[PDB]
Amino acid sequence: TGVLTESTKRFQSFQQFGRDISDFTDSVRDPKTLEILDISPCSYGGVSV
Amino acid sequence: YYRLFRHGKIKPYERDTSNVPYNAQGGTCTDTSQLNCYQPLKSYDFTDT
Amino acid sequence: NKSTPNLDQFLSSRRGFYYFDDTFRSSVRVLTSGYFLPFQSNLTRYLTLESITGRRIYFDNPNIPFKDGLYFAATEKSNVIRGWIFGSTLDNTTQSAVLFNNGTHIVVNVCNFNFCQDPMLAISAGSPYKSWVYTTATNCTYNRLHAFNVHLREHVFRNVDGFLYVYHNYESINVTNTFPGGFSVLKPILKLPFGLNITHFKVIMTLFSNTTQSFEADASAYFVGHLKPLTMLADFDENGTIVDAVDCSQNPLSELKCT
Ligand SMILES: *[C@@H]1O[C@H](CO)[C@@H](O[C@@H]2O[C@H](CO)[C@@H](O[C@@H]3O[C@H](CO)[C@@H](O[C@@H]4O[C@H](CO)[C@@H](O)[C@H](O)[C@@H]4O)[C@H](O)[C@@H]3O)[C@H](O)[C@H]2NC(C)=O)[C@H](O)[C@H]1NC(C)=O
Ligand SMILES: *[C@@H]1O[C@H](CO)[C@@H](O[C@@H]2O[C@H](CO)[C@@H](O)[C@H](O)[C@H]2NC(C)=O)[C@H](O)[C@H]1NC(C)=O
Ligand SMILES: *[C@@H]1O[C@H](CO)[C@@H](O[C@@H]2O[C@H](CO)[C@@H](O)[C@H](O)[C@H]2NC(C)=O)[C@H](O)[C@H]1NC(C)=O
Ligand SMILES: *[C@@H]1O[C@H](CO)[C@@H](O)[C@H](O)[C@H]1NC(C)=O
Ligand SMILES: *[C@@H]1O[C@H](CO)[C@@H](O)[C@H](O)[C@H]1NC(C)=O
Ligand SMILES: *[C@@H]1O[C@H](CO)[C@@H](O)[C@H](O)[C@H]1NC(C)=O
Ligand SMILES: *[C@@H]1O[C@H](CO)[C@@H](O)[C@H](O)[C@H]1NC(C)=O
Ligand SMILES: *[C@@H]1O[C@H](CO)[C@@H](O)[C@H](O)[C@H]1NC(C)=O
Ligand SMILES: *[C@@H]1O[C@H](CO)[C@@H](O)[C@H](O)[C@H]1NC(C)=O
Protein backbone atom coordinates (compact mmCIF):
# COMPACT_ATOMS: atom_id res chain seq x y z
CA THR A 1 0.00 0.00 0.00
CA GLY A 2 1.51 3.31 -1.03
CA VAL A 3 2.17 5.94 -3.67
CA LEU A 4 4.03 4.97 -6.85
CA THR A 5 6.36 7.41 -8.60
CA GLU A 6 8.90 7.52 -11.41
CA SER A 7 12.37 6.17 -10.63
CA THR A 8 15.95 6.92 -11.64
CA LYS A 9 17.73 3.93 -10.07
CA ARG A 10 19.79 1.36 -11.96
CA PHE A 11 19.00 -2.36 -11.92
CA GLN A 12 21.63 -5.07 -12.38
CA SER A 13 20.49 -6.60 -15.68
CA PHE A 14 17.56 -8.87 -14.79
CA GLN A 15 16.08 -7.89 -11.41
CA GLN A 16 12.50 -7.63 -10.18
CA PHE A 17 12.53 -5.56 -6.98
CA GLY A 18 14.91 -3.84 -4.60
CA ARG A 19 14.97 -3.51 -0.83
CA ASP A 20 16.99 -1.78 1.90
CA ILE A 21 18.72 -2.57 5.20
CA SER A 22 15.32 -2.85 6.91
CA ASP A 23 13.92 -5.04 4.09
CA PHE A 24 11.53 -2.30 2.95
CA THR A 25 10.56 -2.67 -0.70
CA ASP A 26 11.01 0.57 -2.62
CA SER A 27 11.32 -0.38 -6.32
CA VAL A 28 9.55 -2.58 -8.89
CA ARG A 29 10.24 -3.24 -12.59
CA ASP A 30 6.42 -3.02 -13.31
CA PRO A 31 6.21 -5.39 -16.31
CA LYS A 32 4.54 -4.52 -19.63
CA THR A 33 6.32 -1.16 -19.36
CA LEU A 34 9.76 -2.08 -17.96
CA GLU A 35 10.03 1.40 -16.38
CA ILE A 36 11.35 1.15 -12.81
CA LEU A 37 9.08 2.74 -10.18
CA ASP A 38 9.48 3.91 -6.55
CA ILE A 39 7.27 2.96 -3.55
CA SER A 40 6.71 5.26 -0.51
CA PRO A 41 4.68 5.00 2.73
CA CYS A 42 1.16 6.45 2.24
CA SER A 43 1.77 8.85 5.18
CA TYR A 44 5.26 9.44 6.65
CA GLY A 45 6.61 12.34 8.71
CA GLY A 46 4.67 13.59 11.71
CA VAL A 47 1.37 15.27 12.55
CA SER A 48 0.72 16.95 15.91
CA VAL A 49 -2.52 18.37 17.29
CA TYR B 1 9.42 -52.19 -10.01
CA TYR B 2 10.71 -50.79 -6.73
CA ARG B 3 14.02 -51.42 -4.98
CA LEU B 4 13.85 -53.61 -1.87
CA PHE B 5 17.48 -54.10 -0.76
CA ARG B 6 20.14 -51.40 -0.57
CA HIS B 7 23.17 -50.79 1.64
CA GLY B 8 22.78 -47.08 2.37
CA LYS B 9 19.94 -44.59 2.12
CA ILE B 10 19.59 -42.15 -0.78
CA LYS B 11 19.85 -38.36 -0.51
CA PRO B 12 17.13 -35.84 -1.43
CA TYR B 13 16.33 -35.44 -5.14
CA GLU B 14 18.78 -38.19 -6.11
CA ARG B 15 17.99 -41.29 -8.15
CA ASP B 16 19.71 -44.64 -8.66
CA THR B 17 19.19 -46.65 -11.87
CA SER B 18 21.51 -49.55 -11.07
CA ASN B 19 20.97 -53.30 -11.31
CA VAL B 20 23.67 -55.32 -9.51
CA PRO B 21 23.43 -58.35 -7.24
CA TYR B 22 23.23 -57.50 -3.53
CA ASN B 23 25.24 -59.76 -1.24
CA ALA B 24 23.69 -59.93 2.22
CA GLN B 25 26.94 -60.66 4.07
CA GLY B 26 29.29 -58.20 2.41
CA GLY B 27 30.20 -55.82 -0.39
CA THR B 28 30.21 -57.45 -3.81
CA CYS B 29 28.62 -60.41 -5.59
CA THR B 30 28.48 -61.36 -9.26
CA ASP B 31 26.57 -64.66 -9.27
CA THR B 32 22.85 -65.23 -8.79
CA SER B 33 21.08 -68.58 -8.16
CA GLN B 34 22.91 -68.97 -4.84
CA LEU B 35 21.79 -69.49 -1.24
CA ASN B 36 22.65 -65.91 -0.24
CA CYS B 37 22.14 -63.83 -3.41
CA TYR B 38 19.22 -61.39 -3.66
CA GLN B 39 18.12 -59.40 -6.71
CA PRO B 40 17.65 -55.75 -5.67
CA LEU B 41 14.30 -55.11 -7.42
CA LYS B 42 10.87 -56.63 -6.75
CA SER B 43 7.76 -56.34 -8.91
CA TYR B 44 4.39 -55.01 -7.78
CA ASP B 45 1.25 -57.13 -8.30
CA PHE B 46 -1.74 -55.11 -9.55
CA THR B 47 -4.26 -57.81 -10.36
CA ASP B 48 -8.02 -57.51 -10.75
CA THR B 49 -9.26 -58.88 -7.40
CA ASN C 1 54.11 -45.93 -21.78
CA LYS C 2 53.43 -43.09 -19.39
CA SER C 3 55.57 -41.76 -16.55
CA THR C 4 54.65 -41.82 -12.86
CA PRO C 5 52.95 -38.48 -12.10
CA ASN C 6 54.69 -35.82 -10.05
CA LEU C 7 52.21 -35.11 -7.25
CA ASP C 8 53.81 -31.79 -6.34
CA GLN C 9 51.84 -29.30 -4.25
CA PHE C 10 51.81 -25.50 -4.37
CA LEU C 11 50.06 -22.90 -2.22
CA SER C 12 46.49 -21.97 -3.13
CA SER C 13 46.90 -18.26 -2.20
CA ARG C 14 43.46 -16.56 -1.92
CA ARG C 15 41.51 -18.24 -4.73
CA GLY C 16 38.39 -20.38 -4.82
CA PHE C 17 35.60 -18.00 -3.75
CA TYR C 18 32.25 -18.13 -5.54
CA TYR C 19 28.69 -16.82 -5.26
CA PHE C 20 26.76 -18.75 -2.59
CA ASP C 21 23.33 -17.13 -2.94
CA ASP C 22 21.16 -15.28 -5.46
CA THR C 23 19.93 -12.41 -3.27
CA PHE C 24 20.76 -8.82 -4.23
CA ARG C 25 22.69 -6.65 -1.77
CA SER C 26 24.38 -3.25 -1.69
CA SER C 27 27.23 -2.32 0.68
CA VAL C 28 26.60 -5.22 3.07
CA ARG C 29 28.94 -7.53 4.98
CA VAL C 30 27.44 -11.02 5.29
CA LEU C 31 28.88 -13.88 7.35
CA THR C 32 28.12 -17.39 6.11
CA SER C 33 29.11 -21.01 6.67
CA GLY C 34 29.51 -23.47 3.84
CA TYR C 35 31.79 -25.69 1.79
CA PHE C 36 34.75 -23.62 0.57
CA LEU C 37 38.38 -24.07 -0.43
CA PRO C 38 40.57 -23.07 2.56
CA PHE C 39 43.04 -20.23 2.13
CA GLN C 40 46.70 -21.22 1.78
CA SER C 41 46.17 -24.97 1.35
CA ASN C 42 48.14 -27.46 -0.72
CA LEU C 43 46.95 -27.48 -4.34
CA THR C 44 48.00 -30.59 -6.25
CA ARG C 45 49.32 -29.92 -9.74
CA TYR C 46 49.37 -32.21 -12.78
CA LEU C 47 51.28 -31.32 -15.93
CA THR C 48 51.34 -32.07 -19.65
CA LEU C 49 54.85 -31.67 -21.03
CA GLU C 50 56.83 -32.36 -24.19
CA SER C 51 58.77 -35.60 -24.52
CA ILE C 52 62.54 -35.23 -24.58
CA THR C 53 64.27 -38.62 -24.68
CA GLY C 54 61.71 -41.25 -25.68
CA ARG C 55 58.17 -42.23 -24.67
CA ARG C 56 58.42 -39.92 -21.67
CA ILE C 57 55.01 -38.28 -22.17
CA TYR C 58 53.43 -36.87 -19.01
CA PHE C 59 49.80 -37.55 -19.91
CA ASP C 60 48.24 -37.02 -16.49
CA ASN C 61 44.62 -38.10 -16.00
CA PRO C 62 43.89 -40.11 -12.82
CA ASN C 63 40.62 -40.59 -10.92
CA ILE C 64 40.41 -37.84 -8.29
CA PRO C 65 37.76 -38.38 -5.57
CA PHE C 66 34.97 -35.81 -5.58
CA LYS C 67 34.19 -35.86 -1.84
CA ASP C 68 32.31 -32.64 -1.06
CA GLY C 69 33.06 -30.39 -4.03
CA LEU C 70 35.93 -29.56 -6.30
CA TYR C 71 38.10 -26.63 -7.44
CA PHE C 72 39.81 -26.99 -10.83
CA ALA C 73 42.28 -24.56 -12.38
CA ALA C 74 44.00 -24.75 -15.77
CA THR C 75 46.97 -22.81 -17.14
CA GLU C 76 47.55 -23.66 -20.78
CA LYS C 77 47.61 -22.46 -24.38
CA SER C 78 45.70 -23.35 -27.56
CA ASN C 79 42.90 -25.02 -25.53
CA VAL C 80 44.34 -28.38 -24.52
CA ILE C 81 41.95 -29.08 -21.60
CA ARG C 82 38.41 -29.28 -22.87
CA GLY C 83 36.02 -31.54 -20.96
CA TRP C 84 35.06 -33.29 -17.74
CA ILE C 85 33.61 -36.68 -16.82
CA PHE C 86 31.53 -37.14 -13.65
CA GLY C 87 30.34 -40.45 -12.29
CA SER C 88 30.52 -43.02 -9.52
CA THR C 89 32.16 -46.10 -11.05
CA LEU C 90 32.65 -44.63 -14.56
CA ASP C 91 31.45 -47.90 -16.12
CA ASN C 92 28.35 -49.11 -18.05
CA THR C 93 26.84 -50.30 -14.79
CA THR C 94 26.03 -46.79 -13.50
CA GLN C 95 24.85 -43.63 -15.25
CA SER C 96 27.55 -41.04 -15.91
CA ALA C 97 27.79 -37.49 -17.25
CA VAL C 98 30.13 -35.80 -19.72
CA LEU C 99 30.22 -32.01 -19.91
CA PHE C 100 32.39 -31.33 -22.94
CA ASN C 101 32.45 -27.68 -23.96
CA ASN C 102 34.95 -27.31 -26.82
CA GLY C 103 34.86 -28.82 -30.29
CA THR C 104 31.82 -27.88 -32.36
CA HIS C 105 29.77 -26.70 -29.36
CA ILE C 106 29.17 -27.47 -25.69
CA VAL C 107 27.83 -31.03 -25.50
CA VAL C 108 26.30 -32.07 -22.17
CA ASN C 109 25.31 -35.73 -22.04
CA VAL C 110 24.06 -38.11 -19.35
CA CYS C 111 24.17 -41.73 -20.48
CA ASN C 112 25.53 -45.20 -19.72
CA PHE C 113 28.92 -44.57 -21.27
CA ASN C 114 31.62 -47.23 -21.63
CA PHE C 115 34.76 -45.11 -21.59
CA CYS C 116 38.17 -46.06 -22.98
CA GLN C 117 41.48 -46.03 -21.08
CA ASP C 118 42.62 -42.52 -22.09
CA PRO C 119 39.82 -39.96 -22.57
CA MET C 120 41.90 -38.17 -25.19
CA LEU C 121 40.42 -36.02 -27.97
CA ALA C 122 42.57 -36.60 -31.07
CA ILE C 123 42.38 -33.09 -32.52
CA SER C 124 44.53 -29.97 -32.94
CA ALA C 125 44.19 -26.25 -32.21
CA GLY C 126 41.77 -25.89 -35.14
CA SER C 127 39.81 -27.87 -37.75
CA PRO C 128 39.52 -30.99 -35.57
CA TYR C 129 39.98 -34.46 -37.03
CA LYS C 130 38.42 -37.17 -34.82
CA SER C 131 36.77 -37.79 -31.44
CA TRP C 132 37.89 -40.52 -29.00
CA VAL C 133 35.81 -40.33 -25.82
CA TYR C 134 33.20 -43.12 -26.05
CA THR C 135 32.87 -46.79 -26.90
CA THR C 136 29.15 -47.47 -26.34
CA ALA C 137 26.14 -45.67 -24.84
CA THR C 138 22.91 -47.64 -24.47
CA ASN C 139 20.38 -45.56 -22.46
CA CYS C 140 20.56 -41.76 -22.74
CA THR C 141 18.43 -39.42 -20.64
CA TYR C 142 19.86 -35.93 -21.23
CA ASN C 143 21.45 -34.53 -24.40
CA ARG C 144 21.95 -30.77 -24.66
CA LEU C 145 23.96 -28.61 -27.06
CA HIS C 146 24.70 -24.91 -26.49
CA ALA C 147 25.44 -22.66 -29.46
CA PHE C 148 29.07 -21.52 -29.16
CA ASN C 149 32.23 -22.03 -31.19
CA VAL C 150 49.17 -18.76 -21.47
CA HIS C 151 45.85 -18.18 -19.68
CA LEU C 152 44.09 -18.98 -16.40
CA ARG C 153 40.74 -20.79 -16.35
CA GLU C 154 38.90 -21.53 -13.10
CA HIS C 155 35.95 -23.85 -12.42
CA VAL C 156 34.10 -24.98 -9.30
CA PHE C 157 31.92 -28.10 -9.20
CA ARG C 158 29.23 -28.76 -6.57
CA ASN C 159 26.38 -31.27 -6.21
CA VAL C 160 23.40 -30.31 -4.03
CA ASP C 161 19.83 -31.68 -4.04
CA GLY C 162 20.26 -33.42 -7.38
CA PHE C 163 21.55 -30.23 -9.01
CA LEU C 164 25.06 -29.97 -10.45
CA TYR C 165 26.46 -26.44 -10.02
CA VAL C 166 29.28 -25.17 -12.27
CA TYR C 167 30.99 -21.80 -11.70
CA HIS C 168 33.53 -20.30 -14.11
CA ASN C 169 36.09 -17.50 -14.41
CA TYR C 170 38.88 -16.46 -16.80
CA GLU C 171 42.04 -14.36 -16.54
CA SER C 172 45.17 -13.61 -18.58
CA ILE C 173 48.49 -14.37 -16.87
CA ASN C 174 52.21 -14.89 -17.63
CA VAL C 175 54.18 -17.45 -15.64
CA THR C 176 56.55 -20.36 -16.25
CA ASN C 177 56.51 -22.93 -13.44
CA THR C 178 55.05 -21.51 -10.23
CA PHE C 179 51.40 -20.90 -9.33
CA PRO C 180 50.04 -17.32 -9.48
CA GLY C 181 48.76 -15.19 -6.62
CA GLY C 182 45.69 -13.01 -6.36
CA PHE C 183 42.02 -12.71 -5.55
CA SER C 184 39.30 -14.05 -7.84
CA VAL C 185 35.52 -14.35 -7.62
CA LEU C 186 33.62 -17.06 -9.48
CA LYS C 187 30.29 -16.29 -11.17
CA PRO C 188 27.43 -18.81 -11.54
CA ILE C 189 27.01 -20.08 -15.10
CA LEU C 190 25.61 -23.62 -15.07
CA LYS C 191 22.97 -25.43 -12.99
CA LEU C 192 21.82 -28.83 -14.23
CA PRO C 193 19.06 -31.11 -12.80
CA PHE C 194 20.81 -34.46 -13.20
CA GLY C 195 20.17 -36.16 -9.85
CA LEU C 196 22.96 -38.74 -9.85
CA ASN C 197 25.61 -39.91 -7.31
CA ILE C 198 28.98 -38.32 -8.23
CA THR C 199 32.08 -39.70 -6.52
CA HIS C 200 34.76 -39.50 -9.24
CA PHE C 201 35.75 -37.19 -12.09
CA LYS C 202 38.29 -37.25 -14.91
CA VAL C 203 39.61 -34.77 -17.46
CA ILE C 204 39.76 -34.82 -21.27
CA MET C 205 42.95 -33.88 -23.14
CA THR C 206 44.05 -33.15 -26.71
CA LEU C 207 47.24 -34.07 -28.59
CA PHE C 208 48.50 -31.41 -31.01
CA SER C 209 50.57 -32.54 -34.01
CA ASN C 210 51.98 -31.27 -37.31
CA THR C 211 49.76 -32.48 -40.15
CA THR C 212 50.56 -36.13 -39.38
CA GLN C 213 48.68 -39.27 -38.38
CA SER C 214 50.79 -39.44 -35.20
CA PHE C 215 49.91 -37.22 -32.23
CA GLU C 216 52.04 -36.31 -29.22
CA ALA C 217 52.40 -33.92 -26.27
CA ASP C 218 51.62 -30.30 -25.36
CA ALA C 219 52.66 -27.77 -22.68
CA SER C 220 50.08 -27.11 -19.95
CA ALA C 221 49.13 -27.73 -16.34
CA TYR C 222 45.97 -28.22 -14.27
CA PHE C 223 45.54 -27.87 -10.51
CA VAL C 224 43.11 -29.70 -8.22
CA GLY C 225 41.86 -28.80 -4.76
CA HIS C 226 39.24 -30.21 -2.40
CA LEU C 227 36.59 -28.30 -0.48
CA LYS C 228 36.07 -28.29 3.29
CA PRO C 229 33.38 -27.05 5.72
CA LEU C 230 34.35 -23.55 6.87
CA THR C 231 32.90 -20.18 7.84
CA MET C 232 33.72 -17.00 5.92
CA LEU C 233 32.85 -13.31 5.62
CA ALA C 234 32.11 -11.45 2.38
CA ASP C 235 31.85 -7.80 1.34
CA PHE C 236 29.62 -6.18 -1.30
CA ASP C 237 29.96 -2.84 -3.10
CA GLU C 238 27.23 -0.49 -4.36
CA ASN C 239 26.55 -2.53 -7.50
CA GLY C 240 26.71 -6.16 -6.34
CA THR C 241 30.27 -7.47 -6.67
CA ILE C 242 32.49 -9.27 -4.17
CA VAL C 243 35.61 -7.19 -3.51
CA ASP C 244 37.28 -9.21 -0.73
CA ALA C 245 36.76 -12.02 1.77
CA VAL C 246 38.43 -13.52 4.84
CA ASP C 247 38.87 -17.05 6.18
CA CYS C 248 37.72 -17.16 9.81
CA SER C 249 39.87 -20.18 10.75
CA GLN C 250 43.34 -19.25 9.44
CA ASN C 251 45.15 -16.93 11.87
CA PRO C 252 44.15 -14.98 15.01
CA LEU C 253 43.69 -11.76 13.03
CA SER C 254 41.08 -13.65 11.00
CA GLU C 255 38.94 -14.64 14.00
CA LEU C 256 39.34 -11.08 15.28
CA LYS C 257 38.14 -9.70 11.93
CA CYS C 258 35.32 -12.27 11.90
CA THR C 259 33.91 -11.69 15.40
C1 LIG D 1 27.39 -43.55 -4.36
O2 LIG D 1 27.85 -44.75 -4.97
C3 LIG D 1 28.84 -45.47 -4.24
C4 LIG D 1 29.18 -46.71 -5.05
O5 LIG D 1 29.74 -46.31 -6.30
C6 LIG D 1 28.33 -45.87 -2.87
O7 LIG D 1 29.41 -46.44 -2.13
C8 LIG D 1 29.11 -47.68 -1.46
O9 LIG D 1 28.97 -47.41 -0.05
C10 LIG D 1 28.88 -48.56 0.79
C11 LIG D 1 28.67 -48.11 2.22
O12 LIG D 1 27.40 -47.46 2.33
C13 LIG D 1 30.15 -49.39 0.67
O14 LIG D 1 30.16 -50.55 1.53
C15 LIG D 1 29.11 -51.50 1.28
O16 LIG D 1 28.23 -51.65 2.40
C17 LIG D 1 28.73 -52.32 3.58
C18 LIG D 1 29.74 -51.45 4.32
O19 LIG D 1 29.15 -50.19 4.64
C20 LIG D 1 29.34 -53.68 3.23
O21 LIG D 1 28.30 -54.60 2.88
C22 LIG D 1 27.60 -54.87 4.10
O23 LIG D 1 28.40 -55.54 5.07
C24 LIG D 1 27.75 -55.64 6.32
C25 LIG D 1 28.67 -56.30 7.34
O26 LIG D 1 28.97 -57.63 6.93
C27 LIG D 1 26.46 -56.44 6.16
O28 LIG D 1 25.80 -56.53 7.42
C29 LIG D 1 25.56 -55.75 5.16
O30 LIG D 1 24.37 -56.52 4.97
C31 LIG D 1 26.31 -55.63 3.85
O32 LIG D 1 26.58 -56.93 3.31
C33 LIG D 1 30.32 -53.60 2.07
O34 LIG D 1 31.53 -52.96 2.48
C35 LIG D 1 29.71 -52.84 0.89
O36 LIG D 1 30.75 -52.68 -0.08
C37 LIG D 1 30.35 -49.76 -0.79
O38 LIG D 1 31.58 -50.45 -0.96
C39 LIG D 1 30.38 -48.50 -1.62
N40 LIG D 1 30.57 -48.88 -3.00
C41 LIG D 1 31.60 -48.43 -3.69
C42 LIG D 1 32.56 -47.56 -2.94
O43 LIG D 1 31.77 -48.70 -4.87
C44 LIG D 1 27.85 -44.63 -2.15
O45 LIG D 1 27.25 -45.01 -0.91
C46 LIG D 1 26.82 -43.88 -2.99
N47 LIG D 1 26.40 -42.68 -2.30
C48 LIG D 1 25.12 -42.36 -2.20
C49 LIG D 1 24.82 -40.97 -1.72
O50 LIG D 1 24.23 -43.15 -2.49
C1 LIG E 1 2.92 -6.31 -23.55
O2 LIG E 1 1.76 -5.94 -24.28
C3 LIG E 1 1.64 -4.53 -24.42
C4 LIG E 1 0.39 -4.25 -25.22
O5 LIG E 1 -0.73 -4.84 -24.56
C6 LIG E 1 2.84 -3.98 -25.14
O7 LIG E 1 2.75 -2.57 -25.16
C8 LIG E 1 2.84 -2.11 -26.51
O9 LIG E 1 4.16 -2.22 -27.01
C10 LIG E 1 4.30 -1.75 -28.35
C11 LIG E 1 5.75 -1.93 -28.78
O12 LIG E 1 6.07 -3.32 -28.77
C13 LIG E 1 3.91 -0.28 -28.42
O14 LIG E 1 4.00 0.16 -29.78
C15 LIG E 1 2.49 -0.10 -27.92
O16 LIG E 1 2.15 1.28 -27.91
C17 LIG E 1 2.39 -0.66 -26.52
N18 LIG E 1 1.03 -0.56 -26.06
C19 LIG E 1 0.73 -0.57 -24.76
C20 LIG E 1 -0.71 -0.81 -24.43
O21 LIG E 1 1.58 -0.41 -23.91
C22 LIG E 1 4.10 -4.34 -24.39
O23 LIG E 1 5.24 -3.89 -25.13
C24 LIG E 1 4.16 -5.83 -24.24
N25 LIG E 1 5.31 -6.18 -23.47
C26 LIG E 1 6.27 -6.90 -24.00
C27 LIG E 1 7.39 -7.28 -23.08
O28 LIG E 1 6.24 -7.22 -25.17
C1 LIG F 1 28.86 0.63 -10.50
O2 LIG F 1 28.55 0.90 -11.85
C3 LIG F 1 28.77 2.25 -12.24
C4 LIG F 1 28.36 2.36 -13.70
O5 LIG F 1 29.15 1.46 -14.48
C6 LIG F 1 30.23 2.60 -12.02
O7 LIG F 1 30.42 3.99 -12.26
C8 LIG F 1 31.16 4.13 -13.47
O9 LIG F 1 32.56 4.09 -13.26
C10 LIG F 1 33.31 4.18 -14.47
C11 LIG F 1 34.79 4.09 -14.14
O12 LIG F 1 35.07 2.82 -13.54
C13 LIG F 1 32.98 5.48 -15.19
O14 LIG F 1 33.70 5.54 -16.42
C15 LIG F 1 31.49 5.56 -15.46
O16 LIG F 1 31.18 6.82 -16.07
C17 LIG F 1 30.75 5.43 -14.15
N18 LIG F 1 29.32 5.45 -14.38
C19 LIG F 1 28.46 5.81 -13.43
C20 LIG F 1 27.01 5.71 -13.79
O21 LIG F 1 28.84 6.19 -12.34
C22 LIG F 1 30.60 2.35 -10.57
O23 LIG F 1 32.00 2.61 -10.40
C24 LIG F 1 30.31 0.92 -10.21
N25 LIG F 1 30.61 0.74 -8.81
C26 LIG F 1 30.67 -0.47 -8.25
C27 LIG F 1 30.15 -0.53 -6.86
O28 LIG F 1 31.09 -1.45 -8.84
C1 LIG G 1 51.79 -29.25 2.06
O2 LIG G 1 52.42 -30.52 2.24
C3 LIG G 1 53.67 -30.46 2.92
C4 LIG G 1 54.24 -31.87 3.04
O5 LIG G 1 53.29 -32.70 3.72
C6 LIG G 1 53.49 -29.84 4.30
O7 LIG G 1 54.76 -29.73 4.94
C8 LIG G 1 52.86 -28.47 4.18
O9 LIG G 1 52.60 -27.93 5.48
C10 LIG G 1 51.55 -28.60 3.41
N11 LIG G 1 50.98 -27.28 3.24
C12 LIG G 1 50.00 -26.84 4.02
C13 LIG G 1 48.63 -26.89 3.42
O14 LIG G 1 50.21 -26.44 5.16
C1 LIG H 1 50.04 -45.44 -24.35
O2 LIG H 1 49.96 -46.41 -25.40
C3 LIG H 1 48.63 -46.68 -25.85
C4 LIG H 1 48.66 -47.76 -26.92
O5 LIG H 1 47.33 -48.03 -27.36
C6 LIG H 1 47.99 -45.40 -26.39
O7 LIG H 1 46.65 -45.65 -26.83
C8 LIG H 1 48.01 -44.34 -25.31
O9 LIG H 1 47.47 -43.14 -25.86
C10 LIG H 1 49.44 -44.13 -24.84
N11 LIG H 1 49.53 -43.17 -23.76
C12 LIG H 1 49.17 -41.90 -23.90
C13 LIG H 1 48.63 -41.25 -22.66
O14 LIG H 1 49.27 -41.31 -24.95
C1 LIG I 1 30.25 -53.09 -20.12
O2 LIG I 1 31.57 -52.68 -19.83
C3 LIG I 1 32.49 -53.74 -19.59
C4 LIG I 1 33.86 -53.13 -19.31
O5 LIG I 1 34.20 -52.24 -20.38
C6 LIG I 1 32.56 -54.64 -20.80
O7 LIG I 1 33.41 -55.75 -20.52
C8 LIG I 1 31.17 -55.15 -21.15
O9 LIG I 1 31.23 -55.91 -22.36
C10 LIG I 1 30.24 -53.98 -21.35
N11 LIG I 1 28.92 -54.50 -21.59
C12 LIG I 1 28.00 -53.81 -22.25
C13 LIG I 1 26.63 -53.81 -21.65
O14 LIG I 1 28.26 -53.21 -23.28
C1 LIG J 1 17.45 -49.23 -21.12
O2 LIG J 1 16.10 -49.20 -20.68
C3 LIG J 1 15.34 -50.28 -21.21
C4 LIG J 1 13.91 -50.17 -20.71
O5 LIG J 1 13.32 -48.97 -21.24
C6 LIG J 1 15.95 -51.60 -20.77
O7 LIG J 1 15.20 -52.67 -21.35
C8 LIG J 1 17.39 -51.69 -21.24
O9 LIG J 1 17.99 -52.90 -20.78
C10 LIG J 1 18.15 -50.50 -20.68
N11 LIG J 1 19.51 -50.52 -21.16
C12 LIG J 1 20.53 -50.12 -20.41
C13 LIG J 1 21.78 -50.95 -20.53
O14 LIG J 1 20.47 -49.16 -19.67
C1 LIG K 1 54.96 -15.56 -20.70
O2 LIG K 1 55.21 -14.53 -21.65
C3 LIG K 1 56.20 -14.81 -22.63
C4 LIG K 1 56.32 -13.63 -23.57
O5 LIG K 1 55.05 -13.39 -24.19
C6 LIG K 1 55.84 -16.07 -23.40
O7 LIG K 1 56.91 -16.40 -24.29
C8 LIG K 1 55.60 -17.23 -22.45
O9 LIG K 1 55.16 -18.33 -23.24
C10 LIG K 1 54.56 -16.85 -21.41
N11 LIG K 1 54.40 -17.88 -20.41
C12 LIG K 1 54.39 -19.18 -20.70
C13 LIG K 1 55.52 -19.99 -20.14
O14 LIG K 1 53.52 -19.68 -21.38
C1 LIG L 1 56.45 -30.62 -37.64
O2 LIG L 1 56.42 -32.03 -37.50
C3 LIG L 1 57.62 -32.56 -36.94
C4 LIG L 1 57.49 -34.08 -36.85
O5 LIG L 1 57.33 -34.61 -38.17
C6 LIG L 1 57.86 -31.96 -35.56
O7 LIG L 1 59.09 -32.47 -35.04
C8 LIG L 1 57.93 -30.45 -35.66
O9 LIG L 1 58.08 -29.88 -34.36
C10 LIG L 1 56.65 -29.94 -36.29
N11 LIG L 1 56.70 -28.51 -36.46
C12 LIG L 1 55.58 -27.79 -36.54
C13 LIG L 1 55.60 -26.67 -37.53
O14 LIG L 1 54.60 -28.05 -35.86
Residue in C with minimal Cα distance to B14 = C195
Min Cα distance B45 → chain C (Å) is: 26
Chain-centroid distance, C-alpha C45: 12
Q: Does B17 touch chain C (CB under 8 A)?
A: yes
Inter-chain CB proximity C239 and A15 less than 8 Å: no
Inter-chain CB proximity B13 and C197 less than 8 Å: no
**CB contact at 8 A, C188 and C21:** no
Closest by CA position to C225, among listed C5, C4, C68: C68
DSSP secondary-structure letter at C123?
A: -
**CB contact at 8 A, C206 and C61:** no
Query: C175: number of CA atoms within 13 Å, CB side?
Result: 15
Measure the CA–CA gap between A39 and A25, rounded to whole angstroms.
7
Q: Which of B12, B14, B20 sits opposite C197 (nearest CB)?
A: B14
Q: Which of B13, B18, B20 sits opposite C195 (nearest CB)?
A: B13
Measure the CA–CA gap between A3 and C92, rounded to whole angstroms.
63
| Other C-beta atoms lying within 10 Å of the C-beta of residue C73 | 23
Phi and psi of A20, rounded to 5°? Answer: -135, -170
Q: Which residues lie below 8 Å from residue C142, measured CB to CB, with a gap of 6+?
A: C97, C108, C109, C110, C192, C194
Q: Does B13 touch chain C (CB under 8 A)?
A: yes
Inter-chain CB proximity A10 and C240 less than 8 Å: no
Helix, strand, coil tally for chain A in percent (to 5): 0, 25, 75
Q: Which residues of A1-49 form beta strands (DSSP E)?
A: 3-6, 17-18, 27-28, 37-40
Pairing of strands C183-193, C200-206: unpaired
Q: Does C95 touch chain B (CB under 8 A)?
A: yes
| DSSP-derived 3-state class of residue B45 | coil
Residue B44 identity (one-letter amino acid): Y
How remote is the CA of residue C140 from the centroid of ligand 7, in Å? 10
Q: Does B18 touch chain C (CB under 8 A)?
A: yes
Q: Kindly compute the dihedral angle of the four CA atoms of residues A14, A18, A20, A24, in this order, to the nearest 10 degrees.
A: -160
C173 lines ligand 8 (CB under 6 A): no
Q: Which ligand 9 atom is the nearest neighbour of the CA of C212?
A: 5
